[PDB]
Design a protein around this ligand. Structure first.
Ligand SMILES: Cc1sc2nc(COc3ccc(F)cc3)cc(=O)n2c1[C@@H]1C[C@H]1CO
Ligand SMILES: *[C@@H]1O[C@H](CO)[C@@H](O)[C@H](O)[C@H]1NC(C)=O
Lengths: 38, 48, 48
């Protein structure tokens, strides 16, 4: 109860949803890797 | 052909007095993060 | 349709590929989306 709304990059997780709510996501992302060619 | 327009996802319809909100959201998160959605896609996408 | 059936009491849970709209959200609550998709144009194949 030290703030009202949190804005940032907070991925939706079960371990975080039981203590704070979230709104409808507007940007879609995921987990990925990046590998160079040469 | 073309490119995606008005990109909006699907959802589960419910009612404002239904107490099954968290119990469904947690199940959806479990399906997403435990590979169930990936398995469903692999079994229902890229047939050829 | 489905929203009318839900509002009339004939149904309580909606599990179908239903999109998300502002008007629908003003009356029917939507859970977390399954997949992120948009709208595309379908054109029949043309022989060379
Ligand atoms: C704009 C964006 S960006 C966006 N990304 C996604 C991607 O899939 C998920 C799945 C679970 C989740 F917890 C969060 C996103 C869905 C989606 O519908 N959207 C949307 C439309 C508006 C929101 C409606 O739900
Ligand atoms: C799921 O069961 C009931 C029905 O929604 C609900 O009251 C309960 O809190 C839910 N269980 C957990 C662990 O949240």
């Amino acid at each position: 109860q030290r703030a009202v709304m949190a804005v940032g990059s907070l991925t939706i997780n079960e371990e975080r949803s039981e203590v704070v709510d979230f709104s409808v996501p507007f940007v879609e992302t995921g987990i990925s890797v990046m590998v160079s060619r040469s | 052909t073309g490119e995606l327009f008005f990109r909006s996802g699907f959802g589960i319809g419910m009612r404002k007095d239904s107490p099954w909100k968290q119990n469904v959201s947690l199940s959806i998160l479990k399906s997403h993060e435990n590979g169930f959605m990936e398995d469903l896609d692999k079994t229902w996408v890229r047939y050829q | 349709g489905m929203m009318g059936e839900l509002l009339s009491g004939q149904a309580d849970m909606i599990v179908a590929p239903l999109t998300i709209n502002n008007e629908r959200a003003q009356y029917i609550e939507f859970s977390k989306p399954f997949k992120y998709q948009g709208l595309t144009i379908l054109v029949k194949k043309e022989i060379p």
